[model samples]
Target chain A: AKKMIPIDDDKLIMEFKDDATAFDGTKKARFKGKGWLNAQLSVIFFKLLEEHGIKTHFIGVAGGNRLIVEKLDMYPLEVVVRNVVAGSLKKRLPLPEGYELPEPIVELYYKNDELHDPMINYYHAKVLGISLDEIKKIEEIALKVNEILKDYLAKKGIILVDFKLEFGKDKNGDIVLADEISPDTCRFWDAKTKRSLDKDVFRFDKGDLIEAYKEIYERITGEKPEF
Target chain B: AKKMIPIDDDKLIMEFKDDATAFDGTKKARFKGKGWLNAQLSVIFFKLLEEHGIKTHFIGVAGGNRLIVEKLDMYPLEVVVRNVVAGSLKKRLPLPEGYELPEPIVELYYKNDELHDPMINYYHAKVLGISLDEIKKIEEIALKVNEILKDYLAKKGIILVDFKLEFGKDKNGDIVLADEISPDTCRFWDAKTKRSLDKDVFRFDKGDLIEAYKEIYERITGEKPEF
Candidate 1:
């Protein structure tokens, strides 16, 4: 769950907390400074996306683990783009972990905490009142975002793996990418060793989450990230 | 499980049993004459589809509960077309039972009983080696079959609520609809009264299974169905 504080008529401050949850909040814990790491990385990823012509809601960092972002009506669906088999995809599908897919797969899930974010399809999106054009546009942009991130991360020796995206309509009624793109929202693995470098550290208790996040931050930016 | 006895080079006799199962075989029972009722309805439905230009594997009904069908290497997937929301869809989605969908919803499930027929998508099919063209064709034919059945059933005052279809390739390598279309594979409701007219009778212990099957047979063919 997210709480937005209005800073102005068109701006809002998103306060990211150290609390981490998975399995629809069945597993919960607080890792100090995890909020700051997530916000910093989200800013970087959103900036990278914007530089490549992807529209986003991020304006700037607001200091203290918060983000100053443009306010938009967010959609209630998670657009997941998968490049390699991992996470729930591996369990639900016949694919084994680390199996490379011939082509990227795009999946949609209705983002409701009470419903545990059940996986849905395009027809469900339409039935929920999202226009056909909007769904098509979201898919086109999601895949493009995947392409940009996959290529960018590959050069840094990070396997892009898969990520979740959210889209919303701004005041102008144009669909723009929304939500944070951090380790919490993406699955990043070491290319050679296949080691988890993202939230799986906490989700599966692989190792120190801060240490994993530090490795990702240092590799991408060539400097240590601040907490 | 089915045991196919070869009748000729291009034909086989499928032996039907009285075994009644649901919930992926978690529930099991033996309903004497159940197989005969299923085969009878399948023959009628298959013939109806054939008359509407839909190719099927059904050749004819053999004596007893056997079927003379064209031998086909069946696809390991189930293509379900939904006209009204019910059953598992109700639980997974935010819809109530009997809620009509805006349009038909097509769902794909991998036909692995060990996996309990996990729900899949077109991408999973492609990853499983089905061509994109084949997937598209399956969707098209499945929807067309839904259309033909819905209209035909509507005239008989039976709502063609939803149905499952399986397709496979013939010796010529063309996709042809396979499997039986009976109460076992479909959800049929009375158009006016919204009564369960299919396997849900046995699924929920609504009433006598034979009585329900005879009612459907009489409604569709204006003759009492032999059980």
Candidate 2:
């Protein structure tokens, strides 16, 4: 619950927790063995993404479930890079079936929390002059992450359908990818039957959430993880 | 109310009453003399639009404050063309001193009443095979409406700042203008001192709505309207 390291642009103080939260911002009433599970999992995955040359806020694994990640001036937009239909996508769009954004589609939204998160347009972006090229770059990089992760999870019989990502600007206005990547942000489905393997386990009374998260952790990291 | 005549391709019949609603659909209550007043005023304006070769859904004045208008497969969008700063534009876009769109902007929206009228994007339209040329044509018609009506109302000390127009397709698959054109659809400001002169008067509790609508009707038609 407290910061363990001095905060910096590249490295951030991390706090670990065993507390679990629902997909729609509801917190579980009780805390479980969440600290160690998240700590090892975050450090391993952040390292994986960093090795792929993708930027992230991850500094290091902190005490228990906490991760020390870089601090960024987060862009108010959620850059979603999808490879398959898994979670909200199936419900959000109307397509025949098996649809993907042939080329990644970049969207601009005026970050207004008060108005049910209304989606904006490029015209609004142009009028505001809010770094159109940078948003383009963000999209490209996000898809790259999706592709790499998709293959990594496939060997473990997990399908990464889609996930949410956030980014921030550095001191020089360079857009650095920020935010944590886990089952919390990604909608992981079972590779074979395409069942929800992420938050939906707890969200829909599916049961065995800690076991599910642990299974995903071992799959990605190729090590026996303890709960 | 039932349709007095056979509906055409340009406009669909939606019931509107002598009422006022405001504050994000929260304030809804009937106001006296609203339906008849707006319906009558809209018919006259639509007739004016047709005369100027600006195609519209307005057919003719019908029974007891009803209008016979062209039927259309309305584009799932509302084209908002603005001249001076007002309403959502003033609050949404960060323009200094209530800046306005340099030229009238043609925006697209997905007509999902369930989603509280979600504003969509070019990609959404494009993925649906909505031709770029058609979007261009729609923008052309929207600006034409603005150009013809802007100065026309300004003459009577009524400043036409902005208004919304919806377009649709006909049975012949031709893009045609649709929707009612009235004080309720357009923002009317007093030309002399920029005083509000429309239903917004009801929103701001300015005063005398029937009189305001009558004044706008008189200003547009050069006829003394009987309230």
The A-chain TM-scores of all the candidates are 0.96, 0.81
Question: lDDT: which candidate is best?
Answer: 1
- Alpha-carbon local distance difference test for all models: 0.86, 0.67
Per residue, candidate 2 scores C-alpha lDDT tens digits across A17-120 of: 56666643555733365456656655666677889988777766545566766667777667666666444444344543336555444345566555434455
CAPRI class of candidate 1: medium
In model 1, pairs of residues that clash are: none
TM accuracy, model 1: 0.96
**Which candidate should be chosen as best, given DockQ against the real structure?**
1
Per-residue C-alpha lDDT of model 1 across residues A1-227, encoded as one tens digit per residue: 24579988788998888888877668988888788788888888999999999999989887788888988888998999999999988766777898999999888888876677878776677888888789889989999999999999999999999999999899899999988898999999999999999989988999998889889889989998766
Model 2 alpha-carbon miss at residue A210, Å: 1.9
Using TM-score as the measure, the top candidate is 1
Global local distance difference test of model 2: 0.67
TM-score, chain B, predicted structure 1? 0.95
